[PDB]
Design a protein around this ligand. Structure first.
Ligand SMILES: Nc1ncnc2c1ncn2[C@@H]1O[C@H](COP(=O)(O)OP(=O)(O)OP(=O)(O)O)[C@@H](O)[C@H]1O
Ligand SMILES: Nc1ncnc2c1ncn2[C@@H]1O[C@H](COP(=O)(O)OP(=O)(O)OP(=O)(O)O)[C@@H](O)[C@H]1O
Ligand SMILES: Nc1ncnc2c1ncn2[C@@H]1O[C@H](COP(=O)(O)OP(=O)(O)OP(=O)(O)O)[C@@H](O)[C@H]1O
Ligand SMILES: [K+]
Ligand SMILES: [K+]
Ligand SMILES: [K+]
Ligand SMILES: [Mg+2]
Ligand SMILES: [Mg+2]
Ligand SMILES: [Mg+2]
Lengths: 524, 523, 523
């Protein structure tokens, strides 16, 4: 359709007004004293949230140029949530401050391209200084503090996430889901815990629990679906000769074969039980082979060539314990070679590195946590649905912050890290004066997270920013108690990945936005 | 007519929005780095001003509740201008800060009238501490610096005011008028100044200042009261064609014989005005004879017997300029005869030597002081009329500030004195907790002039205010050079009267107006 | 009423948009290649003008903020026209350039008051360098070239003004009026000129120039002042039908009762005017007698004894034309008797020879200079009324430029003098960096007249400006022939007063108005 075209300072003012609207919506949540934002949902109750990415996503303005500004600065929070999962509010606070100060220098006649080059140089040096300033975060108390701070100073969430990471180890996978109670519940599972139940209700060895218990059972892995008892009849006879129980992981055991095997189960000759193979095509085979590696067995398939008729006891897998139930199944201490397990771990890690999709990579990480280590599920307990959503978002942010802490390290929180970085970058210079001014607006905008935290606390941002800049090291401002001290000692830690990602994405988008002169939108 | 009524928080936020609009329009002019405001006038070209009271008076909002708030804060600037002539922007800034903090405290559930009592107690104690903190102008001797600071850091205006007050004395009358060239001029000429008032409000000239001016005025003097119009009709007829506006100095004139007939007869080509005669009886005759001898005229008396019909144009006196104001009427330059003026001066000096009673001696020393001091006139030199108006307003502000400085004293400028008196009152407590919070509101709002000065400088008001409060004494923040130092040493001095009046009027209106729950206006 | 208030950049860009509209409408007329502007008038046919002040005065915008900006820049052209009479377009162009560059520097975050101080310092130094650069104008060819350049390169107007100033002297009075024919006619007739102004503002005629004119006026002279109306009512009765407008020259005229009574009695059929007489006492009587003998009339005096009622139509004087302005009143042609005028001239010259006092000799030789010079009346010959108005405005501009040239001096035309004085001030520095940027803004805006002249020529202003700045002295760019050369040699001379006044008034208003953060207007 027809277009409205704005040029120069008019377009810059409209875009900055949109950025200010989005950033003022976002930044009322920053810090521990930050407040919540209600987002109207056309389907369901409104969402009360303290995370900046949701309130950034929900912002869309009537003025098309202001809507441009809002969308472009919303990209900052979207990217910061995609990469680190935390610091979206900090990223938007940084992006707004670079844009306002960058447009001040743009209105001062300085070249926006050179300003963007200066911002990029300053933020590259800032990332280097953050990496130098960072301390690795491996101990449990530091992780608990990171999870607490990232969850609006909720010590319960931080300690629960610290315990979960301690339980599942470094290779473990932790996810957050809703709970039925009012309290946070941690559910840690070990070994293979694929979510398929028994094909028939009659396998139950323990009727008082509905769970089949198999002590040191054999494990058959059929990559094909079976409906006749003929094929594994030699295997069934060999198992009956051995006398140990047998568990089948197959694509489908149904009809005739299933009926005869449950009949043989209640006859007592074989304590057999069959369950469906997990996943779907191109994924079922890989983690079926993972189960085989864990249990020291081999998968029976037509592609690999051997049939169930020539399958023997050596072909079948081995574990010390097997638990069947309605929804899932647990295999405890599969008898497999350790070196093969680590080789499979390395292979799936290489697949993770080669994976360019979040879904495939997260499935591979889940498989790694299944075969090695454990899986933790955090049930968010809340009296109401809106508190469930708010607490779930906070726990997710805390989990992402703990993951970023172990990935890259921690720095002093509350924006003190960016303050120290900007203080260290005082002598950085560009190629010309416009680049130096861009560096200076980048350094000044690194004070924006601390200033906005103090503004949310109700104190004076200038006084506290100058006081923190006067101090050295991790000395900073406790925004909850409104005091001063070594931010590490008071447990206010920020993930280096979160702060660095927020700074980088804010700098990139903000430089691209201050470089603009003309904006072309649709007419109202 | 039909009334729109708002209650509680709705009325309070509407009123505070009006306060904020007026106070922003005023506060953009505070400090040396403050900017100008253009006021559109249907009279002529728009006027550029750095004066707070002009911007405040020109503000009127469309929303009736916001308009009520704007008018009520405009009262602050108007009262500050009437009482001191300077600090209207400071008064408006202090008023807005008190209103904002007091309304925050009202929203905090606390009693607004106890807040008002606390503000009043805090400002009474601050006035006491400002009187204690004040340095007399004789001890300071910084009239040039005070005039420079009040003229937006213009050293020429301060130097001119200092020279005028050195020539005609600290109590001498100084009058600001438009010059002809591009440069300011100082002329100490023989003149008269008497604290008397014009009679009927239909004599106001084209300027809106309320003081009428006359170009080469005719002077008529009388101690007895006229009995009929036909007695003084030829005299008016004598001024009917003679190109000198008639100023009549008599005891007291009513409107029935003069004002109504001169309104009906005359459309206003030449301003004819009458004034009261200061003193009574022998004193009235004495100053009438003195003014007649200044202007070369004569005084008609019953004992003399010479009537106004026999009076001619040459017999009556003539001046070069006369400015009539309600507070004080001045004759800038009466020619007369210099030898006659000197002889009259010597005669009154010999009368001083002869006289011995305290009242006669003091009134006669007042006469000789008025004669010797004369009138100092400052010609505002500017290239254009808008520059003329702006520079005239700045010189008038400098004159008012220097007069307040010699009358009351001087303190540290740039809101530093208010910072100091707020620091000295941290121990002050009211009757209850609400009064204590009102005291804290007043003390926090006393920092507002400095913070607004810094905001106009573009720096950080919190950092500068905390640095100044960390210091003691005249330590403050030079906003012209953006750096700290002893405020007296760098010449940034504020009149004690100006600061005290701004604080008092802002506190009074703001404390009265934070106690409002309901607001009633038209629709 | 209700006020719309704008702040900061919004108010600044609205005001600058108004400035740009007014300045474009004015600037399309700059230079020899500049075009005309048609102004619609409610009284009749539209007027075509190349004069900047007419276009500037007629500009009024619908948007209130833009209208305020337009009025403030209209002040520049009005002041330039009132002072010099030429360079209104140059003044507006310089004003707009200073406003644009200063607002750019304000958007650059810098202090606008320091920018204003820098602009004022730079323009003061430029005025000094223009006084140094000025060459005294003591050539008839220089007068002709100044008149030609100021009349849009019309050599006939320049030659006519040169002949007039050669005939009546460089200090003689020259009056421009309409001519019946299609050609300009220079007539050096015997006339009177005295620097006096009218009293009653009602006496302004149908033309809006502020000067009244009379067709074959009756002359009345007086050294004493009458008392009642009845002393002059019969004369007012006689002139009531006499066919000649009654001009009265008394000692000190006033419309205290004359103006209102003549307003009530007369609706405006024929103008009646009263003006002051120059001098006082014996000197006033001397010039009154001289004017009476020039017009063949008599002066009423108490010593002489002859009264107004005694005087008849034949006894009192009569003239052919009288033009009354506030600055100076002229009697273009008082017939009287030629032999009587010659005898009076001889007697007054004999009075010079007899007198030995310096003041007496100088006033008597002023009398004979006024008598001998007379009035040089220029008849504007044009085929139509709109052409008559345009050519009359051009001749008036040429006259004002020649007056400013013989008063102050001449410099290179076409903005070259401003280019040179901007080049000489590249070393000038202010108190701080913001004042330096204001100085640079003023210096860059001093190139604006030349750049706008080139833009009206259609060539490239940057190339021509850089070529001129590369040169030195009177080297400049002849815009009539679109080629470079010595500005003085090809006769493109500008008055020093015109350029200096344009620069000063533009600088004053622009420096005052780039310092504005808030603007308050109606809704
Ligand atoms: N008690 C505290 N004292 C000081 N700083 C704190 C405190 N608690 C949190 N912070 C700081 O608050 C900043 C941001 O907190 P918050 O979690 O609300 O924002 P965010 O991570 O930017 O937002 P989001 O979850 O939308 O990505 C961090 O830099 C953190 O160090
Ligand atoms: N160089 C300076 N440094 C610091 N403060 C200054 C300086 N010059 C002036 N001030 C302060 O700024 C104020 C003067 O501002 P301004 O004269 O514009 O307004 P005002 O005094 O409130 O009154 P008004 O607007 O009626 O003239 C005073 O408080 C004075 O002490
Ligand atoms: N032939 C020419 N070559 C170069 N410059 C010229 C020439 N003729 C005139 N000028 C210049 O152009 C200007 C005259 O233009 P114009 O008379 O239209 O406007 P102005 O002087 O600004 O005043 P106004 O519009 O009030 O008459 C002067 O600066 C003069 O020096
Ligand atoms: K947040
Ligand atoms: K002010
Ligand atoms: K022109
Ligand atoms: Mg967060
Ligand atoms: Mg002031
Ligand atoms: Mg011209």
């Amino acid at each position: 359709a027809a277009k409205d075209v704005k040029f120069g300072n008019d377009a810059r003012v409209k875009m900055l007004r949109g950025v200010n609207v989005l950033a003022d919506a976002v930044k009322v949540t920053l810090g521990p004293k930050g407040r919540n934002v209600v987002l109207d949902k056309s389907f369901g109750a409104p969402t009360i949230t303290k995370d900046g990415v949701s309130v950034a996503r929900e912002i869309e303005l009537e003025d098309k140029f202001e809507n441009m500004g809002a969308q472009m600065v919303k990209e900052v929070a979207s990217k910061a949530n995609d990469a680190a999962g935390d610091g979206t509010t900090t990223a938007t606070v940084l992006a707004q401050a670079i844009i306002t100060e960058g447009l001040k220098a743009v209105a001062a006649g300085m070249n926006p391209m050179d300003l963007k080059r200066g911002i990029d140089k300053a933020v590259t040096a800032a990332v280097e200084e953050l990496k130098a300033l960072s301390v690795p975060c491996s101990d449990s108390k530091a992780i608990a503090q990171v999870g607490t701070i990232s969850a609006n100073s909720d010590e319960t969430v931080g300690k629960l996430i610290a315990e979960a990471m301690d339980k599942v180890g470094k290779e473990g996978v932790i996810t957050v889901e809703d709970g039925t109670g009012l309290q946070d519940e941690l559910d840690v599972v070990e070994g293979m815990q694929f979510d398929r139940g028994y094909l028939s209700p009659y396998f139950i060895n323990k009727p008082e629990t509905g769970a089949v218990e198999l002590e040191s059972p054999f494990i058959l892995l059929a990559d094909k679906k079976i409906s006749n008892i003929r094929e594994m009849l030699p295997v069934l006879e060999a198992v009956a000769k051995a006398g140990k129980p047998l568990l089948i992981i197959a694509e489908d055991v149904e009809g005739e074969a299933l009926a005869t095997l449950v009949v043989n189960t209640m006859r007592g000759i074989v304590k057999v039980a069959a369950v469906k193979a997990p996943g779907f095509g191109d994924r079922r085979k890989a983690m079926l082979q993972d189960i085989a590696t864990l249990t020291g067995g081999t998968v029976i398939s037509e592609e690999i060539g051997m049939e169930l008729e020539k399958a023997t006891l050596e072909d079948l897998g081995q574990a010390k314990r097997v638990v069947i139930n309605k929804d899932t199944t647990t295999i405890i201490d599969g008898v497999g070679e350790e070196a093969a397990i680590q080789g499979r771990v390395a292979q799936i890690r290489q697949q993770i590195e080669e994976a360019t999709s979040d879904y495939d990579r997260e499935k591979l990480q889940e498989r790694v946590a299944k075969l090695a280590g454990g899986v933790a599920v955090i049930k968010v307990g809340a009296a109401t649905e809106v508190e469930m959503k708010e607490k779930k978002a906070r726990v997710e942010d805390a989990l992402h912050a703990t993951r970023a802490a172990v990935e890259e390290g921690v720095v002093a929180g509350g924006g003190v890290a960016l303050i120290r970085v900007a203080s260290k970058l005082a002598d950085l210079r560009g190629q010309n004066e416009d680049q130096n001014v861009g560096i200076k607006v980048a350094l000044r905008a690194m004070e924006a997270p601390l200033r906005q935290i103090v503004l949310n606390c109700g104190e004076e941002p200038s006084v506290v920013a100058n006081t923190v800049k006067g101090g050295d090291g991790n000395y900073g401002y406790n925004a909850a108690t409104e005091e001063y001290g070594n931010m590490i000692d008071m447990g206010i830690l920020d993930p280096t990945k979160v702060t660095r990602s927020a700074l980088q994405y804010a700098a990139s988008v903000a430089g691209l936005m201050i470089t603009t002169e003309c904006m072309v939108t649709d007419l109202p």
